[PDB]
Amino acid sequence: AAKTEQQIADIVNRTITPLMQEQAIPGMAVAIIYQGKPYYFTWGKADIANNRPVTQQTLFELGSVSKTFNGVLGGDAIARGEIKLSDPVTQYWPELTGKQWQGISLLHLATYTAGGLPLQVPDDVTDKAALLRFYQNWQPQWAPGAKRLYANSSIGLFGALAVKPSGMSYEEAMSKRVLHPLKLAHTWITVPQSEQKDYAWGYREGKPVHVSPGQLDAEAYGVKSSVIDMTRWVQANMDASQVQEKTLQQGIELAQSRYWRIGDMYQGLGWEMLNWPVKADSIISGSDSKVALAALPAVEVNPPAPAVKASWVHKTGSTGGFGSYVAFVPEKNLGIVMLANKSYPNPVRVEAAWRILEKLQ
Template sequence: MRLSINITALTLLVSGSVLAQSAPDAVIKPLMQQYQIPGMALAVIHNGKTEFYNYGVASKQTQQPITEQTLFEIGSLSKTFTSTLASYAAQQKKLQFSDAASQWLPALKGSAFDNVSLLNLATHTSGTPLFVPDAVKNTRQLMAWYQHWQPQAEPGTVRVYSNPGIGMLGMIAAKSLEQPFINAMEKQLLPAMGMQHSYVQVPSAEMKRYAQGYNKQDRPVRVTPGPLDAESYGLKSTSSDLIRWLAIQLDEQKVAPAWQRAVAATHQGHYQTEAFTQAMMWEYYPLPVTEQQLIAGNSSARIMQGMRATRITPPEAAPQQAWYNKTGSTNGFSTYAVFIPAQKTAVIMLANKWFPNDDRVAAAYRIIRALNQ
């Protein structure tokens, strides 16, 4: 059963029973009012059914309503696609996660990247910072910055959220597959996943479905090009495609075996931190988990500050009794993705305005709790 429900809906049918207005309407509506969010798209998998809940408008100017086919910038949720591409390359024997990064980028031979593995890049344990400096505008300048970068701690000992790290992994994965990253994503991975309305570069014919984003000052914005944008935060997608992505994570939506193995490999636990287990871009928390634990683990402090990380050897088999999640943001968009294998439950939340991770996590937690009551 598929529902597309307007913000004025009072009750929602889920799993054959009536889900009261408390979830998701009573969760999402106050959130939109609090942060003056023009539009949100929510999709839920529960008990073998997928439901869509659409709120508000894609643009305050056009008043075009949100649907499950509205394109949103998904920010760092893009990183889970990049890690899956690298995992697929490894499945195809094109690379190994034990490889040093400099093995793939000869210009970095003799640099700190001699001691940074591809696994470090895939798990935020390379030590590279959140952003490259503002002065870095192109690939030549990026490589020069990489050459001179020095870690503050030994790679593999600290988990530091990093666009340059996953961005480098995307570059290397594409190189191993002998094609540009955008081609590898748009012509290989996304079609293999059956995601027909997801793009790094939105075609002109699809621009009409591309939501307008709004920043904290309510000014209209969209993501601007920059070094490693495609690899780190550049995907645009729909709630329909992204709930399919989460169904694939749950193994509820089948794809070709090589791709399913690549997806599954990204769920293995490689590093333990004080807040969560770090898989390949996904983070997971053993069940039961509290709302406060999830908020703390996804807080801006966790992104801006490093945490000690302990290598798990051998990698931990992906637990079923766990809450897997990933946030994503651009200046004008907010994303939160959750899947829980043991419950066969998943949620994708998309908004065309930035609002804090804490509130995204709390909203998803309360919706999932209501589903399970």
């Protein structure tokens, strides 16, 4: 018996209501993809001050979910034959000298195994000249491919280098090559003046906050999107076959290939996958900052393993004011998008998603 909208409504409501309460989230937006059909739900308020409620059109900061956009754009470029994952970083930024860079490829940056690029670009690095200096002076902790350390400075750099051949900016390339084709008209890097009325305020210690500028912001954490756009984004990735642009369909597929095995978890391009069915505890406890930010040994999958439908694909993302979570199981044609205007613990996100989806499988 296929569940009915109202049964889906009770499961969702039953889970989120309590969550919003204990974590004290001002507003939320959730989309369920159940047998390929989207169901949207909205709770709370986007601007406590101006008393504006969350809508299906409300823009949320995706934080690190932005990395999924990066991975796919990189994929498309590969597909076009513009870049090769195996190519040296040096090829793309010749101004970037230093023998510590000699054996590092695109792959290593994309997949956080370059040898310890830090989580964030330093606080005293706020312009492009400082950026070059930073990387020029950077001192590797491990040999390339040795371990995985989750870092904005790694994937961030991958994004910037990957659009180089095209001669487009990242923002231009992203709009042209991915957003336009999938009709993500409510997905932005820079939110227009015209759309400010739909831009939710993020809440930090009860204070309204928006993500600030930074080196490699667009590439690692600066996408803004609505419940509806996140949902089309999930559908497209869930099944690349529906995508008309051959290169984009191919990039989606490459982004979901498996390059590294990091104990039961596989690293794609922005997306992280686990085999299905998976144990709840594995995903929940692997989402904790204690595990997710650690340096772990990485076993290489070369040639990469292809995207399989029997997988649990997901990405967590946060900003000072926002908490996002997205997951999908291609094989069951099920997924969830969870957008909040308050950053709350990773494991609570993952755990609530699982609760909802276990009930629908």
